[PDB]
Amino acid sequence: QSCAPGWFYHKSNCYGYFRKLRNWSDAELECQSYGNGAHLASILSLKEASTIAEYISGYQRSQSIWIGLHDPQKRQQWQWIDGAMYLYRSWSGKSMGGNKHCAEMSSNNNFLTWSSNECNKRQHFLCKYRP
């Protein structure tokens, strides 16, 4: 039940991926359920995604993993749960589409490109926990 039994300690924090098909609504709720501030992978800069991606990259088996990226109230703005605000995101050779109600990585894109989808598509999801 602690952060170690089979759990991997990375970045001094505890995080783990789940290969279960769960909608973003049941996926995120399953995280904050710990009330420890647990939520879907949070990314404010490419530096963080660059290190975690090296682990979940999946170049040998890229799976559709969800992250903590969603739209506010249809204001055409992409923000994370904590309201994280990315400053000038990279955009070249890809298309966000609008992130609709929830954005995720399409398994068809080998470059792990992001894609907009409804928060009702049951798919894999990665969770994060703050120490």
Q: Which amino acid, residue 31?
A: C
32 labelled ligand-binding: no
110 labelled ligand-binding: yes
Residue 37: Cβ within 10 Å count? 14
Task: Tell me whether residue 104 is exposed, middle or buried, using C-beta atoms within 10 angstroms of its C-beta: 0 to 12, 13 to 18, 19 or more.
Answer: buried
Measure the CA–CA gap between 105 and 54, rounded to whole angstroms. 15
Q: Which domain holds residue 88?
A: 1-131
76 labelled ligand-binding: yes
63 labelled ligand-binding: no
**Residue 53 has which token pair?**
């991606």
Torsion sign over Cα 98, 61, 47, 90: negative
- Residue 93 DSSP SS3: coil
- Residue 19 DSSP SS3: strand
How many separate domains does the chain show? 1
Q: How was this structure determined?
A: NMR
108 labelled ligand-binding: yes
CATH code, domain with 45: 3.10.100.10
Backbone angles phi and psi of 66, in degrees to 5: -95, 160
